[PDB]
From a paper:
In [name], the recognition and import of opines is conferred by periplasmic binding proteins (PBPs) and their associated ATP-binding cassette (ABC) transporters; but there is no known structure of the opine-[name] complex. In this work, we investigated the structural and biochemical properties of the [name] [name] of [name] C58 which senses at least two opines: nopaline and pyronopaline, a lactam nopaline-derivative that can also be found in plant tumours. [name] possesses a typical fold of cluster F within the [name] structural classification.
To learn more on the role of Met117 residue in the interaction between [name] and its ligand, we constructed two [name] mutants with different short polar residues: [name]-[name] because an asparagine is found in the OccJ sequence and [name]-M117S because a serine is found in the LAO/HisJ sequences. Both mutants displayed a similar KD for pyronopaline that was 76-fold higher than that of the WT protein, proving that Met117 is a key component of the ligand affinity and belongs to the nopaline-binding signature. We also obtained the structure of [name]-[name] in complex with pyronopaline. Prior to this, the stability of [name]-[name] was verified using differential scanning calorimetry (DSC) and, compared to the WT protein, the mutant presented similar Tm (60.12°C versus 60.25°C for the WT) and ΔH (1.59 105 cal/mol/°C versus 1.4 105 cal/mol/°C for the WT), meaning that mutating M117 has no significant effect on protein stability. The structure of [name]-[name] in complex with pyronopaline confirmed that the replacement of Met117 with Asn led to a loss of hydrophobic interaction with the ligand and showed that His170 which is free to move towards Asn117 bound the carboxyl group of the α-KG of the pyronopaline in a position not observed in the WT complexes. A loss of the polar interaction between the side chain of Ser169 and the terminal OH of the pyronopaline ring was also observed due to steric hindrance.
Author numbering: 28 to 281
The structure:
Amino acid sequence: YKSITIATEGSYAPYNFKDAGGKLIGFDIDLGNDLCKRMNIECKFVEQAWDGIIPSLTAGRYDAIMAAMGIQPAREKVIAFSRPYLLTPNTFLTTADSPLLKTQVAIENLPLDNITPEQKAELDKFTKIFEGVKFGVQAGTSHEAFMKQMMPSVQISTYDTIDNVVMDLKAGRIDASLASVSFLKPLTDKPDNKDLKMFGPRMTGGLFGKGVGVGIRKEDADLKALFDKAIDAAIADGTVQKLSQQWFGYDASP
Ligand SMILES: N=C(N)NCCC[C@@H](C(=O)O)N1C(=O)CC[C@@H]1C(=O)O
């Protein structure tokens, strides 16, 4: 390889978004550039809407995806992934005045790989509390899949971008949402968002898979091996931890 094009969304701060000059910035951009430097590959980042991000990769419009993409089992049927470059659980979001905040959480860290009767009872409790609660999630995500598969009785609205979900939550058009802690913690840490709060179990596994990875075509085994070697090196030397603290305000490195 000499040069690659990496697609990102540009609507998921602080992983990938746009600066004042309209340039793509974020953890995914800084990490992508760092990995390409380690691989000795010229790096170009391109903006791509979420709906076509995977088919544009398999159609050969670009070489890789770095766009806060969970290493999701359903996506693994279509594309390959690098080893994880970030780890995160997933949790709920509501307003600071919501009565949902008073809900007791019985299972703080809830793994979904092998749901026990105890874990199912906790999911069922939140499903019942969510009756009559209007949820909003980003379309085409594991958050949409979790609500449709694990909480089908809950009213759900899907949105083109997470920015429109947050806008409708602030406006009172929806009552709650679901996204990763890596997205929600920096969002709720902003003084701009003192009126928003994370709540509920912090979920991992199951349909979410494990970690965030670089999406790569299945046939590009050499490119995956190059990314995996570079990611291992960037974790080992503290680069992923450094960039995670810079963008997220905490260490989400594997
Ligand atoms: N708009 C974007 N560029 N990405 C949205 C990814 C949302 C979701 C996913 O992959 O479907 N995520 C998870 O399931 C774990 C990590 C990731 C997230 O919410 O940060």
